[PDB]
Amino acid sequence: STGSATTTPIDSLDDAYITPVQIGTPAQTLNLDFDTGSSDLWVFSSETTASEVXQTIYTPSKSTTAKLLSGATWSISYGDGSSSSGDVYTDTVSVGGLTVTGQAVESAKKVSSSFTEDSTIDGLLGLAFSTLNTVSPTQQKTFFDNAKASLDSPVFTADLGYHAPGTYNFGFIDTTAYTGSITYTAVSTKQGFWEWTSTGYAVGSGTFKSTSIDGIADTGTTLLYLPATVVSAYWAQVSGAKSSSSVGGYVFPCSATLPSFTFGVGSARIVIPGDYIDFGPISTGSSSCFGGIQSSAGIGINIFGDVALKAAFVVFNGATTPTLGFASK
Amino acid sequence: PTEXRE
């Protein structure tokens, strides 16, 4: 079997992407944020505290296939300080025509303020390794892990758009969606992430520096977070750019024409166009814009978020030894 | 901006 679903930006800044998901019998359609940096499928629900709901909800008592997982609870927090917690059902879940039976669906009892404030996101669908799942006492498998037995190949692909719709595919590689060939690189699962080592970088039309950059592929993070010395080398080539203590990163004039940024995948090279690194104005009508490349020093790990991933066709190979592939598009 | 686990 295979599945194919359309993914859409939530707003004009590409802050996040949403994908439809069918839960239960008859199907209830919710728009979820597909997150390769976490491993929980959780939703707004009929159980969520009413003052914390502003979203489409899942009602397990209206699904003939829902089963309560007795004794099970969950609790998660993310890199931005947001959080949620609750209890656990198993139910039928479909994505783009691909159906899984017995999937764990984590029903929120409570959500943090940033989730209440965002009307467009009905929950998250995690696609990292199942060792990061937060259900206790026994951790639960991701949607991808449960689908592998039926899939035509144990793979999914991410094709995110720049201010445009894109696609998540399960079980096949669409050879018409990229240019050139896919280059694969080794993955470490020691911390539970799609963790890999880039071979180096170049700024604009300058020289490629061979320097190892350990980081994670995270569709749930908006920006590209890299070492302080690498980020300083990029913004040195933008004449109005400065670090702003009060805004919380590099800012620059909206009228600048920005250089591209290239990262290494083995011997291959992925080029991020300069326009992708203009995140947008600090407020509507401002002369100053926020940068899409920022220092990772406050996180402690480098993060290849949407600014980087939307420049490529990305293959998440979930064979017993996993690998990560990148192609230009 | 979002920063999806800690």
| CATH at residue A242 | 2.40.70.10
Q: Considering only CA atoms, which of A37, A12, A33, A8 is closest in space to residue A278?
A: A12
A323 and A257 belong to one structural domain: yes
- How far is it, in rounded angstroms, from Cα A167 to Cα A156? 11
The one-character DSSP state at B4 is: -
- Phi, then psi, of A100 in degrees rounded to 5: -120, 130
A17 and A162 belong to one structural domain: yes
Place of tokens 């909800």: A57
- How far is it, in rounded angstroms, from Cα A212 to Cα A214? 6
A87: β partners: A73, A107
The single-letter code of the amino acid at A320 is: T
Contacts of B1 in chain A (CB under 8 A): 15, 80, 221-223, 279
C-beta neighbour count of A54 within 10 angstroms: 12
Instruction: From A173, A204, A231, give the residue that closes a domain.
Output: A173
Buried b / exposed e over A233-261, threshold 16 CB at 10 Å, is bbbeebeebeeeeeeebbbbebeeebbbb
Contact between A167 and A7 (Cβ < 8 Å): yes
Alpha-carbon dihedral A111, A40, A299, A251, rounded to 10 degrees = -70
A131 and A224 belong to one structural domain: no
User: Nearest Cβ partner of B5 from A132, A222, A305?
Assistant: A132
The single-letter code of the amino acid at A236 is: A
C-alpha distance from A206 to closest chain B C-alpha (Å): 30
A121 and A265 belong to one structural domain: no
Q: A 153-172 residues with CB below 8 A of B?
A: none
Contact between A184 and A324 (Cβ < 8 Å): yes
Q: Quick one: A29 exposed, middle or buried, by C-beta within 10 A (0-12, 13-18, 19+)?
A: exposed
A190 and A61 belong to one structural domain: no
A243 and A220 belong to one structural domain: yes
- Look up residue A274 and give its two tokens: 């300069």
Contact between A106 and A79 (Cβ < 8 Å): no
Instruction: From A173, A200, A220, give the residue that closes a domain.
Output: A173
A189 and A211 belong to one structural domain: yes
- How far is it, in rounded angstroms, from Cα A107 to Cα A287? 43
CA angle A17, A20, A22 (to 5 degrees): 150
Contact between A201 and A264 (Cβ < 8 Å): yes
Instruction: From A142, A173, A204, give the residue that closes a domain.
Output: A173
Q: Quick one: A14 exposed, middle or buried, by C-beta within 10 A (0-12, 13-18, 19+)?
A: buried
A61 and A72 belong to one structural domain: yes
- How far is it, in rounded angstroms, from Cα A45 to Cα A58? 5
A184 and A297 belong to one structural domain: yes
Residues of A involved in catalysis: 35, 198
Contact between A125 and A141 (Cβ < 8 Å): no
Tally the domains of chain A.
2
- How far is it, in rounded angstroms, from Cα A224 to Cα A279? 11
- Phi, then psi, of A50 in degrees rounded to 5: -60, -35
Resolution to 1 decimal place, in Å = 1.0
Give every CB contact of residue A71 below 8 A, 6+ residues apart in sequence: A137
A233 and A286 belong to one structural domain: yes
A23 and A138 belong to one structural domain: yes
Contacts of A305 in chain B (CB under 8 A): 3-4
Place of tokens 């989730």: A115
User: Containing domain of residue A237, as a range?
Assistant: 174-328
A187 and A222 belong to one structural domain: yes
Q: Tell me the three-class secondary structure of chain A, residue by residue.
A: CCEEEEEEECCCCCCCEEEEEEECCCCEEEEEEEECCCCCEEECECCCCHHHCCCCCECHHHCCCCEEEEEEEEEEECCCCCEEEEEEEEEEEEECCEEEEEEEEEEEEEECHHHHHCCCCCEEEECCCHHHCCCECCCCCCHHHHHCCCCCCCEEEEECCCCCCEEEEECCCCCCCCCCCCEEEECECCCCCCEEEEEEEEECCCCCEEEEEEEEECCCECCEEECHHHHHHHHCCCCCCEEECCCCEEEEECCCCCCCEEEEECCEEEEECHHHHEEEECCCCCCEEEECEEECCCCCCEEECHHHHCCCEEEEECCCCCEEEEECC
- Look up residue A246 and give its two tokens: 């009060």
